[PDB]
Design an enzyme around this catalytic site. Structure first.
Site, PDB file in Angstrom:
ATOM      1  CG  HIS A   9      36.374  35.877  39.543  1.00  0.00           C
ATOM      2  ND1 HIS A   9      37.659  35.888  40.065  1.00  0.00           N
ATOM      3  CD2 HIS A   9      35.702  36.893  40.177  1.00  0.00           C
ATOM      4  CE1 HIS A   9      37.721  36.882  40.971  1.00  0.00           C
ATOM      5  NE2 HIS A   9      36.556  37.523  41.075  1.00  0.00           N
ATOM      6  N   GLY A  10      34.032  32.424  37.552  1.00  0.00           N
ATOM      7  CA  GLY A  10      33.841  31.407  36.543  1.00  0.00           C
ATOM      8  C   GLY A  10      33.778  29.987  37.069  1.00  0.00           C
TER       9      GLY A  10
END
Lengths: 133, 165, 133
Positions: A9-10
């Site tokens: 994520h990110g």
């Protein structure tokens, strides 16, 4: 060599790779993707596919993702489903990345590499604690 | 020469750091590692931690420069391939003076410090470190600087030549 | 809460925290440092100390680092040595960070948090493999 794709994520995947390369030197046949709020698994599948197009996937593909069950994991799961020599391993950490990248050059079999990645990832988690004197 | 065989001499004030010792151990085919340092040898706590994290199948030993010359003077390790870990090139010239044979020295890494000049991304040399490297080169000993075996090899003299004349 | 400091070679620590916050929301009482080629453990000790000055360390400090034996680990080791409620855990990964940050709010004891971080970090490493049908 066996292809490795990192997804989190990110924007951490690119940095985990950078960290590894700081330890091992620049790596070949490695891809990564980011996951931004607003995107869904279908967006990620496209991102993974675009990365794979640039990789040598003849010996297989190992997706190293942040956590079990997140979007990066779910999308990778949909790609490896009925593919031989495709696997997804959650909980990616530096010990796993370093050991996996090192072994990859000695041309291990796919099952051997998958087993080593899980074992080194887990053994890499260790507390210092009091030491004997 | 008919005694122990120096598989490789890696200089590093950190001794074992990251997978550098793990990867270098497998690539160098080394089953034994000897640390030569009086400061570390005087640290029983550090010795315990290094010995407990000694890579599987690989043994790590801690001895002083005087004791190291004697271990090499024993044919018990003849043919055995051992890796020598040093923290400063000064200790390497000392082993050579004791009649130790070294064909080349590899610079793994050196913590930077004030008053020193940075020659590489993480390699620093002082007027004392440079003087030791020049003596080794004058003896026909090769000096290569590299962090990992996968990185391009550079010549210590070339890096110091573009800095110190 | 118990303070958490993340340190990794390069610039990954900040991103691992960002990833966690993408999952959990912004976090309080968390610090991080980077490690650049040319720096040594002494530089890192200063960096860690500067971060600690800004943290509430009354209940303790947990340093989460990338790998056992690297500079980030070595410097953190020198700080926790004779300090109560100070620990260093190598192999930091997202499952460890997320579980640890979640539990921290329920005010666990220091030993409890350290044990949970190691257990969740290890259990977080898991391969997908073939699934039953």
């Amino acid at each position: 060599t066996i292809a490795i794709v990192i997804g989190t994520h990110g924007w951490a995947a690119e940095q985990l790779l950078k960290t590894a390369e700081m330890l091992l030197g620049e790596q070949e046949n490695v891809g990564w993707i980011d996951f931004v709020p607003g995107e869904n698994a279908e967006t990620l599948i496209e991102k993974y596919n675009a990365q794979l197009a640039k990789l040598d996937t003849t010996k297989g593909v190992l997706f190293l993702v942040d956590t079990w069950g997140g979007s990066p994991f779910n999308a990778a799961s949909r790609i490896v489903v009925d593919k031989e020599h495709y696997e997804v391993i959650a909980g990616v950490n530096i010990p796993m990345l370093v050991e996996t990248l090192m072994a990859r050059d000695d041309d291990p079999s796919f099952d051997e590499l998958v087993a080593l990645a899980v074992e080194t990832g887990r053994e890499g988690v260790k507390a210092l604690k009091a030491k004997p004197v | 020469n008919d005694y122990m065989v120096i598989g490789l001499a890696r200089i590093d004030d950190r001794l074992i750091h990251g997978q550098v010792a793990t990867r270098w151990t497998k690539e160098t085919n080394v089953s034994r590692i000897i640390v030569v340092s009086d400061e570390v040898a005087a640290d029983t706590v550090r010795k315990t931690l290094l010995t407990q994290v000694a890579p599987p199948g690989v043994t790590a030993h801690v001895v002083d420069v005087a004791k190291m010359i004697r271990v090499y003077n024993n044919p018990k390790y003849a043919g055995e391939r051992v890796m020598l870990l040093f923290t400063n090139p000064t200790d390497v010239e000392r082993l050579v003076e004791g009649g130790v044979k070294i064909t080349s020295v590899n610079v793994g890494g050196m913590a930077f410090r004030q008053g020193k000049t940075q020659v590489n991304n993480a390699v620093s040399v002082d007027e004392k470190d440079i003087e030791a490297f020049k003596k080794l080169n004058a003896r026909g000993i090769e000096l290569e600087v590299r962090k990992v075996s996968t990185d391009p090899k550079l010549k210590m003299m070339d890096l110091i030549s573009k800095i110190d004349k």
